[PDB]
Amino acid sequence: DQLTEEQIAEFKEAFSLFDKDGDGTITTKELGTVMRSLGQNPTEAELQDMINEVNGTIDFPEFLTMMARKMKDTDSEEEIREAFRVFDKDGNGYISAAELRHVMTNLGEKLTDEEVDEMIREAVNYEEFVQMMTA
């Protein structure tokens, strides 16, 4: 979905190195070992729930979908938090309301001036604005 090329490549490399020759069918213990080798450390109940969500053989598309559920979102949130501290001179996380209004008006697609002003008045930290936009 919203993954990166390097992440999918590493996942496929790990799946090909752990699984034997033949089809992509793996067992429950094999899936747990692949998850532990990939970097994730899920509990027993969480692993059982993820297995039930997808013979008991986990194929490549289901595994890629399970890996793309939250990793891409976390990476995007980290990238947004890193890029939000660019307009600030010192990057302390707090900026004036006029600067944020100008940034929202002159950037971020085409937005109406009245709507941008109303959104700025309804809303100091960038994380607070991100959480308000996510809500």
Side-chain angles (χ1 to χ4, degrees), residues 3 6-19 21-22 24-28 31-33 35 37 39 42-45 47-48 50-54 56-69 83 87 91 93 97-98 108 123 135:
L3 280 189
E6 182 69 27
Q7 301 182 2
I8 302 179
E10 183 71 25
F11 288 155
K12 175 59 182 177
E13 180 71 25
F15 192 83
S16 60
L17 193 137
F18 176 75
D19 194 11
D21 57 328
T25 58
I26 54 180
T27 60
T28 62
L31 182 73
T33 314
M35 195 84 57
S37 300
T43 61
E44 301 290 334
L47 182 60
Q48 180 259 356
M50 291 174 60
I51 288 178
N52 284 124
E53 282 182 356
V54 300
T57 62
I58 296 91
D59 305 337
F60 191 74
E62 288 84 2
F63 182 71
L64 189 149
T65 304
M66 283 193 296
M67 296 316 108
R69 180 175 291 109
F87 195 32

